[PDB]
Design a protein around this ligand. Structure first.
Ligand code: CRS
Ligand code: CRS
Ligand code: CRS
Ligand code: CRS
Ligand code: CRS
Ligand code: CRS
Ligand code: CL
Ligand code: NA
Ligand code: NA
Ligand code: NA
Ligand code: ZN
Lengths: 21, 30, 30, 21, 21, 30, 30, 21, 30, 21, 30, 21
């Protein structure tokens, strides 16, 4: 999930907004 | 260690900005 | 516990803090 | 929603937990 | 203290408010 | 390493929310 | 992407987030 | 500057990137 | 140094930043 | 207290340090 | 690891407070 | 730079304002 993906490597804005509703 | 919990604090603040009005679900175990 | 107004980043911070491992949903449109 | 309850008005701990998963 | 307790493991809200005045 | 200092930044922001009007003493060496 | 008002800390957060490795300049006087 | 564009008014992603290095 | 208004989270951030190892007390009621 | 000094009014570095321990 | 990126988030928020009106350039690779 | 200096050891306010414009 978001913790696994984005707390291992830096998640850009484009990667983060995939988790928006 | 708390850096993962600290990381989550930055995650939801970032999601607050990026997602705006459409909001978001934060699921630490998903 | 204290009762106060919580808006914007502080509201997301509060949710992240209170909900813990459950996570939360922030849907401001309603 | 959460804005009218917790931001415009004041929510209790029980009210805020309504928005946990 | 609070740094020793809450920077080793996650401190919940209930544990954090023990440090309020 | 600064993660302990970074952790303290989150601690006092959390205490600001949780404690509200009753305030708090932050004592890193206590 | 959403379009919204960004001021103060959220504006710096947004810059840090968008600009990434490029970095940014925050010159509020103008 | 950035304040009148992005704070007082609303900026797009392209507008915000004008203030990247 | 700059002189500015500091309220809420920024006031606690400022205290945490300035006071360093001394720590601080944030008593908003007064 | 600190609110009337540093939030409602503007505090100097010396004034803010009055609230250090 | 993201703690360096997390550290930068605190850096620019601190620079926002400390620098005030004179602003700052944030250059992660400089 | 600022990342090298201030993410290895704690940078005080006096050290941080050297990076102001
Ligand atoms: C915005 C942000 C914070 C922390 C980690 C990331 O990958 C992204
Ligand atoms: C206005 C805006 C642009 C880009 C990203 C954001 O989170 C917000
Ligand atoms: C709120 C918070 C931040 C960092 C560590 C903790 O245990 C709790
Ligand atoms: C209003 C409220 C509820 C629970 C925790 C807080 O810090 C604030
Ligand atoms: C007003 C003030 C004093 C000291 C440091 C700051 O960032 C701001
Ligand atoms: C204010 C701040 C945050 C993180 C590291 C530092 O050295 C200083
Ligand atoms: Cl952190
Ligand atoms: Na309580
Ligand atoms: Na998008
Ligand atoms: Na100075
Ligand atoms: Zn952090």
């Amino acid at each position: 999930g978001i913790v696994e993906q984005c707390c291992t490597s830096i998640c850009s804005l484009y990667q983060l907004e995939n988790y928006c509703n | 260690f708390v850096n993962q919990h600290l990381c989550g604090s930055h995650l939801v603040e970032a999601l607050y900005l990026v997602c705006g009005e459409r909001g978001f679900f934060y699921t630490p175990k998903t």
